[PDB]
């Protein structure tokens, strides 16, 4: 169940379920799997935050053993689109889809914790069928691939080919180690 | 509401209540009577379920929940209405007839209400749920209406003779006018 | 669990879900798979939104992996049947349905995000029974195939050929390479 | 999830589900396969809405791929007994008991769209056991058939011979094809 | 999700679900297998209705397929006991239990729909275990089957003979048909 | 789901389901087979009654099938220590537990449907392990079955050996034949 | 508010209104009428449906609601007036073409006014819900401001004779101007 | 489903679920097998209580069949540290850890229904992989077994000795025979 | 069923379940195996008792029997980031990433009950496939365990070396067992 | 309201309370006494569950919710008053029975009740909810009421000496006028 919390205003009290109470303060909660649903939610919350205030910043604290490829551009791209700079922390846990989120924030408003971890990979799939139909889906494979790469050299800042030939397998980067790769700028320690 | 309570409770023990200027309005002469329909629900309804349980004691029972013991404690005595008997009831009709036969007898019409018409005039306006408020209502629009309009006009400005009646066919009320 | 947001109204403050809230600024989401029940909530928030102001236009973000054709279709439908004019932004993914109903929305008003990837194939059915059965179910089978067909050309303006031959085997149009297609007329970044 | 909607009334604002207010505008919706559950909620939203006002015409949807004949009976015979109109609109696709309830509307008020798929056929059923009950069994469902199309020819005015050879197996009626089959008439987009 | 109609009252607006809204118009549905659960539901419902007027007739809708005949008991028990008369509108698929209920109604007061379909058919009941334990359920249930079909008689007036005739074996009644046997009074005119 | 039956009040009105107000009305409901869940709810209920009227008699309906014997003993002996006499009403069906519970009424206050039925057996619990462990949970069971035979006898009236030979093997006791066995006064017809 | 209802409800039961000052007012000779523009919004209100062809023709239902039944009880009757006809409306514009004549009068400037003109002032000038209230604004600025241009500077400063015509095809009102 | 129950505080209405009704009243009630969730439901139910008022005393009803042994401590341990009194009321049944909550309540203030019954029986639980961590689990559970002893002989007030030899093996204890044996204080007939 | 309590407050009245009338007081309860999405509720409860008081402490009633170790790390980042001292308690059992928790509270402020068991051992993983994938994943746990010994060594204050031999097994310390052990500072029977 | 007890505050310790134009007044010599029944309905309030629990403590819990600790610091002493029991109420009944003879030694009438009167009046209106109020109807019930109509017509209204008198077959009380 998820707690109730009273907010006090000068118009009186309020009581808003903890991750609303959350929500007002223009804090996102990025947790498991990333899905079309869950996703959904996330968009829908950064829009709400814009259109209340597009100059502040909001914070996405993400917690997620990755997901659906799909799913997670769909974040990514209303975070650049957006005006507001979508700050992003590595909370326990990140991964495939879950660490690009984190590096898609906006330079300068990147954070991890001092005993978080972060994972990436490359895209998992596979298709079962005729040869032909493989060959289109294969495709894809590789055209997410390089595109992916793309996206996270131009925030790490990273070459292009350090990136695929990093990521052609699984790479366990503790929370110091992240800002060396550039994935975030610092450690949050404290502000 | 429950402020309105609290000032009476202090008007049943002492009799006085003050104001905003500070003037002590002393009216221990004054009767206090209050009206009601709180426990009347619950005599009417039985108790829901296959048995019926006493229902004696539910009516006070009602009115100890919603009135406070201290106010309740104030009341000199609690009036229990009882709901009318098919013959008082018949009884209203001529009260209310009376009035129109002398309010036009002096005018002089004459007016023979039959005991038909009487008869048909309680149930209709003689709700259990309202009471005999819409009588006033019904004897309006039934006899008040069509009357008035020759009043003015016709051989109903003098003479009188009107003699009302119903119509078993119809079961409406029919309508008398004479020199 | 969908959050919760609050409306500054001049009346007063009103609490509302964050689809609700969205919704209230002509806004709908198709999200999930196709179905009868999804597709069927989508026109009730379609209709309410005519009623209420007709000259404002509707938006939609359509971000789905495909479903159903039969309950896909009565989307179609509804859209061009309401004056206001149904915007349609991809978000994330468009299948085959998602990107029929991609289409379908007004022309000049249809976008696409940089990273969105669209996808369109042929209707997928089966059927058993004795041979004269399928003869007569797989006439309805290659009718709404081809039928399609011209109601994607109609928004899209692609010839017949052009469409039955892509639309024959699996298909993945990238966010560019869909404004050249001609399903969309260009990508949403700044305005 | 349901969305939630605010309707500006002359007392204030009131909240109630997306449902809620097109019921409120007798707008009933029928979706999915037809069971005896969601057929009394059809029902009694035809119950409640005339007695709020009998005068007025009610509405139905109908994007159902199929259902049971004795579910779907249920909200046949409500439109029936009742005054207000039921217009029939076949949303996506009808179906066996789809289209029956599609074209039980009042002549004239069932309307249609374009990309509409309609698909009529005889009802499917079996029993298992005994001979005796199987003869039984077997020879009802053949009765409601024939009722089937003896109800189904009046709301279409298609001869009983001709109806019934059609519905003998699976037939697939386009928007088009079934305004002239005499099922459904065309929606004014106008 | 039931719909949540709204209703006009002097004190103020008022939120209730689509059966609660017809439950002040002592119109209660019946649907599904009769279960002990919903039987009680049926029954409080009753008996709220009763308190609030006891000489307004009930309506009592009924498209149940059939259930355990004991919990059925406990409506048609509680429908003789309740002074208001509960009319029964038979308008889907009525099995014995359903029907049963059907029959129970007020003399004068039952209807069914025109393509409303009952079938009457013994209870069926089964058990297992030891010859003496079989014995004693297998008596049982022939008393059972004697106290439904003697109450079935005197509710729908048809000589026992007749009524325990044609239960032996499973029967299906349309409509038209039932007002012949005495099971229903007559259809609805409009 | 469960119906809402509103009351009217002075103040203003007041939404209640249909189980709560007729629990106003003192009547309890016994549905469905015993449980230690079920039970408290009804053991509450009844503690909740002998506060707000310990004169007013409880009407507790049974329409259960039968269930544990554990949990049947929180409501029996709730009945009994509780002041109010509670008014046992048959519906349906009453098995052993069941009638257990009906016949431990008040004296004078049992009541059966003309058409209800009510049935009674032995337990049929039972226990499988270690021999040494049979015997210790073997003994229980038969003072539990001679408990309540003992309890019934007091109820009914009759002798322990003659439940005894009752109990030995299953029963089924008509509405008419409960009287003649003495579990109620008469049926309910008049009041 | 609700507080005013109220006070209707006192002179509509004893026919007194007191005053603070002390003053006793009676109302026995005074007649009261009071007039509520409900139930247009919900008529004219668009339907949810997919039609949109619903219509309510209800709207004395929503005259009940908005008022308590307490009130309704008071009154006797209540007044429904009919949404007025086209050819009504046509009378209504020859009333303000008459004041604008008698107007003109005094500077020796007539005013002829053709039966097709009439006809675009009528549907112009009438709405549903405001009924004739912009017929007042419409017939001025469509006939009395082009006047005032060329009465100001043109052929009509003297002479008159003014004439008004419409074209079929754009159905526009063109005025033209004789010395 | 939970019925709901009216309360005529002085302030006015108040509509109270039967629960939250009982719980006002210190009455507190433990069913179903003993668990970690439900466990914590209890003894947030029980610090609730101390501070609302401590001089008055808890009232705690066990109706359950026996769990999780680890959950059952922490019960027991909050209701030693509350200064308040937590009478227990075995309804029905009680199994090991809810006789030993049971026995657990303070001196004069357990209580026992006459028809109810107990039982206590040895900790059981199993391990299964290597024998060193065999081993290490074994005595685990063995270390268990002398606490819950140690600690049920101080409150029933026999031997540690009798204790063990009796709970080697479950022992079914009813309402008198509890009494003799130390775990409860009186029966609650009739106060 | 989550019991309802009232707050009694001099504007008025104010309805909150169980759990959310705790965290009004600092109170978080830590019941259950360990996840993503129930790390969140932990998360956001310390954020929220941070913004209404900077320096009061926080309390955590750890009663779970471990779970995800990288997701309950988010947990102790924030107990160590928030200036509060997040005071921790022990109800029943404690195991891996259980326990982690229970000694990260400030000095001074630790507790456990007499009767709380605690567990503590290595963490416990599996990943098969290619002989290169299982040696990067073996590293990471292989780390993750480094860091778990180091980090627990400065809140106990044993040496690195002392705790990475107990951790290669399970080891059971019992409540004087953990108190020596330095895993919390004293018990709660007097305080 | 809660915030009105805030005034009492310098009253209690500073003994002053300014007013709008500065004048200070002095409450040394005043004895302030308040009058509250917060905790009654607390302490009646019937338990619910099998061992009854002690409501006496919830009385002064329900006091300090009420009034702030400031103000009950301040107070020199909270008097608990408890139920009057049965022997008060003899007691009470000679009270009213006194203040009766006094109203009527005015008129010249003298009233003599028995013991046994006053020991079967008293326990038809012992009521501990209510305290002694309901000795005051019980008492206007059964003596003033069959006192009211010979005082004013009647033996009673020159001469009194009334004798009240039970019998016990009847169990009802008798009244002699001897004028």
Redesign the interface.
């Given at each position: 169940?998820?707690?109730?919390?009273?907010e006090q205003t000068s118009?009186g009290?309020?009581?808003?379920?903890?991750?609303?109470?959350?929500?007002?303060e223009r804090?996102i909660?990025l947790?498991?799997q990333v899905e079309?649903?869950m996703?959904?939610?996330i968009?829908?919350?950064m829009?709400?935050l814009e259109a209340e205030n597009p100059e502040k910043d909001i914070y996405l604290?993400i917690?997620?053993?990755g997901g659906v490829i799909?799913?997670?551009?769909?974040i990514?791209?209303?975070m650049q689109?957006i005006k507001p700079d979508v700050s992003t922390i590595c909370?326990?846990?990140a991964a495939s889809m879950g660490a690009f989120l984190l590096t898609a924030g906006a330079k300068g408003k990147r954070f991890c914790?001092?005993?978080?971890?972060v994972m990436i990979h490359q895209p998992l799939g596979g298709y079962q069928g005729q040869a032909?139909?493989i060959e289109?889906?294969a495709?894809?494979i590789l055209?997410?691939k390089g595109?992916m790469n793309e996206?996270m050299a131009l925030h790490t800042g990273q070459s292009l080919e350090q990136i695929e030939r990093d990521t052609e397998?699984?790479?366990?980067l503790?929370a110091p180690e992240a800002v060396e790769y550039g994935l975030v700028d610092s450690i949050?320690?404290?502000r | 509401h429950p402020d309105v309570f609290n000032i009476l409770l202090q008007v049943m023990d002492n009799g006085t209540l003050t104001d905003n200027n500070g003037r002590k309005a002393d009216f221990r002469n004054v009767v206090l009577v209050m009206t009601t329909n709180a426990g009347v629900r619950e005599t009417e309804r039985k108790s829901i379920g296959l048995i019926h349980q006493d229902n004696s004691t539910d009516a006070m029972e009602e009115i100890k929940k919603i009135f406070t013991p201290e106010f309740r404690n104030r009341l000199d005595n609690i009036i229990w209405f009882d709901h009318l008997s098919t013959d008082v009831i018949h009884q209203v009709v001529d009260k209310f007839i009376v009035e129109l036969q002398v309010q036009l007898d002096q005018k002089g019409v004459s007016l023979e209400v039959s005991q038909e018409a009487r008869n048909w005039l309680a149930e209709k306006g003689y709700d259990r749920a309202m009471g005999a408020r819409p009588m006033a209502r019904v004897i309006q629009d039934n006899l008040k209406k069509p009357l008035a309009n020759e009043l003015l006009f016709g051989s109903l400005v003098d003479g009188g003779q009107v003699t009302v009646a119903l119509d078993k066919e119809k079961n409406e009320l029919t309508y008398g006018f004479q020199s």
């Open positions: 169940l998820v707690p109730m919390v009273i118009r009290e309020r009581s808003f379920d903890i991750y609303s109470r959350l929500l007002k804090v909660f947790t498991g079309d649903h996703a959904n939610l968009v829908a919350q829009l709400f604290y917690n997620s053993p799909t799913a997670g551009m769909s990514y791209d209303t689109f909370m326990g846990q914790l001092p005993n978080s971890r032909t139909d289109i889906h495709r894809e055209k997410v595109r996206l397998r699984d790479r366990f503790s949050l320690t404290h | -």
